[PDB]
Amino acid sequence: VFEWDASEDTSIDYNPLYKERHQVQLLGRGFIAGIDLKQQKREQSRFYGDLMEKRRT
Amino acid sequence: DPEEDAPVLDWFYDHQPLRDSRKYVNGSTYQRWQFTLPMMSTLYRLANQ
Amino acid sequence: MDFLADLMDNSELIRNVTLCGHLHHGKTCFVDCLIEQTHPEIRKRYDQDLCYTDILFTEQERGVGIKSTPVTVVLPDTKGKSYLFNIMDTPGHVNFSDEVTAGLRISDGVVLFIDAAEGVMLNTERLIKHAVQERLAVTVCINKIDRLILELKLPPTDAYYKLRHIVDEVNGLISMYSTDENLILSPLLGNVCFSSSQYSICFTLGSFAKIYADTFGDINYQEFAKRLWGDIYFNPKTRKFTKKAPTSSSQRSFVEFILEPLYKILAQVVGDVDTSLPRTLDELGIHLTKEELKLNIRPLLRLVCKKFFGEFTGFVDMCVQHIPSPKVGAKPKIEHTYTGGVDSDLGEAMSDCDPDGPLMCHTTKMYSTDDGVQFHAFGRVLSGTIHAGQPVKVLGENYTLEDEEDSQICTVGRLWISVARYHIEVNRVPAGNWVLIEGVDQPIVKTATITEPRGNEEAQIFRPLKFNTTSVIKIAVEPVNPSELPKMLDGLRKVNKSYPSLTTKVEESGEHVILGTGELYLDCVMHDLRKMYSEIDIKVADPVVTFCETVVETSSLKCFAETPNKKNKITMIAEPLEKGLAEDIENEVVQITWNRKKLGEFFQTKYDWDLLAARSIWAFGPDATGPNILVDDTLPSEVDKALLGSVKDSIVQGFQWGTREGPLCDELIRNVKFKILDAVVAQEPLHRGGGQIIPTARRVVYSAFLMATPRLMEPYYFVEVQAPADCVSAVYTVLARRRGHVTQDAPIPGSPLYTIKAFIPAIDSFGFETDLRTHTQGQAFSLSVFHHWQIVPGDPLDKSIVIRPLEPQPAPHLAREFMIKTRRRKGLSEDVSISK
RNA sequence: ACUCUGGUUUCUCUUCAGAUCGCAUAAAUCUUUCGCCUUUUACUAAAGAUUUCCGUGGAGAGGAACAACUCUGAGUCUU
């Protein structure tokens, strides 16, 4: 079998907490390897960006 | 970038970047590399991806 | 080496101090740095920590401290005098708080490690509170100062702001618990010490001023330090210290002279090793070889800080100046710890800490060797000298001056002083020291008082080790092969010795339940049981918490019981106790040892009770400090008082037994007020015996409790989580899933991390740490500690409810389930019998 | 502030490898369970035992490099 069967999947969870893993913002300045920085910037929730702009004097 | 990558631009794309540079590498055997903080920071900034 | 033993002769050049703090606050790293300073041949690896003072396999593998470890070591002082220090390396995890207390009881002083970036956190607050309870000397060390430089990059002014805020918070917390104002903490006073244990930085104001003096000369480091903190500023025009800034943009003295050099010495090592480091290294007199300059940033920084700050004399002189020696600090220890008190002749003898006085040691620690079949006692010598190969008389926790059964005569073989992993054998140990004792494991169970036989026969014991938290987690433990049951039983004894707060209890059905504070506590307990003591396979039941029993309404009618002689009739009523009053009895606010006038005054004044009712109070609940009250209410116009006093004691034991084992949940009646409304005592002594009255008292207590509508109290844990801002919303949902209500969410000052404090049911708190850590990808970490019993939703006496198996029942059903299954775990009946 | 201090590189060889030999990762054989099963040759996937292979460190020995003073430090090094 060249490909892999879908039955081999281990990340099957009935718990929504594990189904929806809270993504790490990495202090709003870190970036996960591989993904282009622009896509992550426009994808990140920008909670830290909002906090920074609120605390920007 | 001529300004950000100042230390590494000379030897970044060589076959063995710093082989004959006795300061950074012990010799032709190309072992036990010794670097400086600026070039390491430049390399990290380039390799953030 | 011999000087180490000879220094024990002088009772002033020894300091008994315990190192306590929150989880991972550099305590073990600090002890490693001290060891490296005093042991030339011991050096940590460049990337891996030394991990010294941690000898257990679990200690290294988990990375969390488990067992408090004794470290005896000689350190020079700031002036240059070699003092002797004994250190309790205590676990910072709240679940191992008991492991602190065993080392806290025999410790004169407390060094509180607080992480600079983290803040106070929960275990630090609990530790300072509990150390205030023993009235120990308090010193604060803000460790991990580098985290304000190399992690947050806070400006030195903001770094001073953060340090001052932390110090003020600690001082306010102490003032909220300790009445004595002498416990104020300030670096100029020698209380607060700054440190970064990873890079071997350890300095106080005095130590840094002395460094300045040795750099220049003819400088009074004491008076210089007394002007090196606060709103004080420095003027170089006049070289003068003022209370106002000489200029507009001037910096404070602490920033100017202390924080600034540290910032620059770190920056020149982390950023400019090859460019600017040699210049500043030659400037400060630090001479590093060519090879030494070739190390990585962290080992090089540690090396340069070791060469610059030199010895750890700041910690040494802090302990010398603020932590009393055993000779002078024994008096409060005897006042608070010994049962007989300082008034007695033994109290006076042991207060002086006389090496020639009567022999008396207080053992509160048990250590397991490689075999695990022979434990070693560890404790403080409070008077006299113990000798190797000597007969001693060991007392027990229940020993009194009457009962001589609890004692036992044992021969002590070779004994040693434990320096973490290695211990130095010594022929004898004078008073005030911490000693490992051999050959006394068999009669010693947890707390122990050891004295010499054939003398000082009027010797009592010290008060039992009191723990801050109430162990509520309970796990049943069985053997896989019943043919190997005795071995596991043996192993149980061992763990019961090893862990001070471990309670191993065999129930009626034969289930060996073990009481633990939290998940990690029981995990380590069972790892030790399987892999070190029993060495046989074991089985665990599903974890469950204990439950208490209470009442919420007055008993509908007075419930009566009669002796089998049918001549003594006791009729009682049931009511709940007032708010806080149960907590008052829990915290020993009011004690049965109080004379009747004082306790009556407390009850009538603070809680608005009747003066006669306050004088009518008979006894407390399950123990002397039980949260239940037994109050006489027989009217003198119908019931004789002197005759009733004969059986008052027997009724007291009966009520205590009834509160110990509740009719509903088989244990732990809590927050219940019982009034005896009628007493018919048989006129002859033989018809009112204890064997007759006590069962009758138990029956009447059960009837009164059950007649009033009972309720089950489940323990609510107070869990605070330190997490980044983005994870707060997720933590809210995770706590909402497990029926927990959120109280506070305060962002930590000087750090981008919030701290959310909430209350979660302990029965629903299992796996909460793992859930929260994995759900937020390790960003949110939690610690759980017992907070308070709370009424569980539901009615335990509503039989119309049907319990669906293997299903999480709704709240109105929970109580019923929580008792019924509990009864099945005890082997008891299906339903509580009101008649019985 | 001084006299002597004597290099480092590189090619080999010979032994020892404790340590993540290796901040990387193979294959084969054998033995147990296996999955396929129908004969070898390929195999399924876990455990256990060796082995070979791509590498590695140290020590010692023998060359070349190739110069060379010195580096560095033993100290009296001095105002």
Curated annotation (Swiss-Prot), chain A:
Function: Involved in pre-mRNA splicing and its phosphorylated form (by SRPK2) is required for spliceosomal B complex formation. Independently of its spliceosome formation function, required for the suppression of incorrect R-loops formed during transcription; R-loops are composed of a DNA:RNA hybrid and the associated non-template single-stranded DNA.
Post-translational events: In vitro phosphorylated by CLK1 and U1 snRNP-associated protein kinase. Phosphorylated by SRPK2 and this phosphorylation is required for its association with the tri-snRNP (U4/U6-U5 tri-small nuclear ribonucleoproteins) and subsequent spliceosomal B complex formation. May be phosphorylated by SRPK2 on Ser residues in the SR domain; the phosphorylation is required for the removal of inappropriate R-loops during transcription.
Organism name: Homo sapiens (Human)
Family, per entry: Belongs to the DEAD box helicase family. DDX23/PRP28 subfamily.
Part of the full-length chain shown: 273 to 329 of 820
Gene giving rise to this polypeptide: DDX23
Complex formation: The phosphorylated form (by SRPK2) is a component of the U4/U6-U5 tri-snRNP complex composed of the U4, U6 and U5 snRNAs and at least PRPF3, PRPF4, PRPF6, PRPF8, PRPF31, SNRNP200, TXNL4A, WDR57, SNRNP40, DDX23, CD2BP2, PPIH, SNU13, EFTUD2, SART1 and USP39. Identified in the spliceosome C complex. Interacts with ERBB4. Interacts with ERCC6.
Protein name listed in UniProt: Probable ATP-dependent RNA helicase DDX23
Subcellular location: Nucleus; Chromosome
Disulfide bonds: none
From Swiss-Prot, chain B:
Portion of the full-length sequence here: 196 to 244 of 2335
This protein's domain notes: The MPN (JAB/Mov34) domain mediates interaction with TSSC4 and SNRNP200. Has structural similarity with deubiquitinating enzymes, but lacks the residues that would bind the catalytic metal ion. Contains a region with structural similarity to reverse transcriptase, presenting the classical thumb, fingers and palm architecture, but lacks enzyme activity, since the essential metal-binding residues are not conserved.
Source organism (scientific name): Homo sapiens (Human)
Function: Plays a role in pre-mRNA splicing as core component of precatalytic, catalytic and postcatalytic spliceosomal complexes, both of the predominant U2-type spliceosome and the minor U12-type spliceosome. Functions as a scaffold that mediates the ordered assembly of spliceosomal proteins and snRNAs. Required for the assembly of the U4/U6-U5 tri-snRNP complex, a building block of the spliceosome. Functions as a scaffold that positions spliceosomal U2, U5 and U6 snRNAs at splice sites on pre-mRNA substrates, so that splicing can occur. Interacts with both the 5' and the 3' splice site.
Expression tissues: Widely expressed.
Disorder association: Retinitis pigmentosa 13: A retinal dystrophy belonging to the group of pigmentary retinopathies. Retinitis pigmentosa is characterized by retinal pigment deposits visible on fundus examination and primary loss of rod photoreceptor cells followed by secondary loss of cone photoreceptors. Patients typically have night vision blindness and loss of midperipheral visual field. As their condition progresses, they lose their far peripheral visual field and eventually central vision as well.
Gene behind the chain: PRPF8
UniProt-recorded name of the protein: Pre-mRNA-processing-splicing factor 8
Superkingdom in the source lineage: Eukaryota
Cellular localisation: Nucleus; Nucleus speckle
UniProtKB/Swiss-Prot annotation, chain C:
Subunit structure: Component of the U5 snRNP and the U4/U6-U5 tri-snRNP complex, a building block of the spliceosome. The U4/U6-U5 tri-snRNP complex is composed of the U4, U6 and U5 snRNAs and at least PRPF3, PRPF4, PRPF6, PRPF8, PRPF31, SNRNP200, TXNL4A, SNRNP40, DDX23, CD2BP2, PPIH, SNU13, EFTUD2, SART1 and USP39. Component of the pre-catalytic, catalytic and post-catalytic spliceosome complexes. Component of the minor spliceosome, which splices U12-type introns. Within this complex, interacts with CRIPT. Interacts with ERBB4 and PRPF8. Interacts with PIH1D1.
Gene Ontology, cellular component aspect: Cajal body; catalytic step 2 spliceosome; cytosol; intracellular membrane-bounded organelle; membrane; nuclear speck; nucleoplasm; nucleus
PROSITE patterns from the UniProt entry: G_TR_2
Protein name: 116 kDa U5 small nuclear ribonucleoprotein component
Binding site for GTP: 21-28, 89-93, 143-146
Organism: Homo sapiens (Human)
Keywords of the record: Acetylation, Disease variant, GTP-binding, Intellectual disability, Isopeptide bond, mRNA processing, mRNA splicing, Nucleotide-binding, Nucleus, Phosphoprotein, Spliceosome, Ubl conjugation
One Pfam family hit: EFG_IV
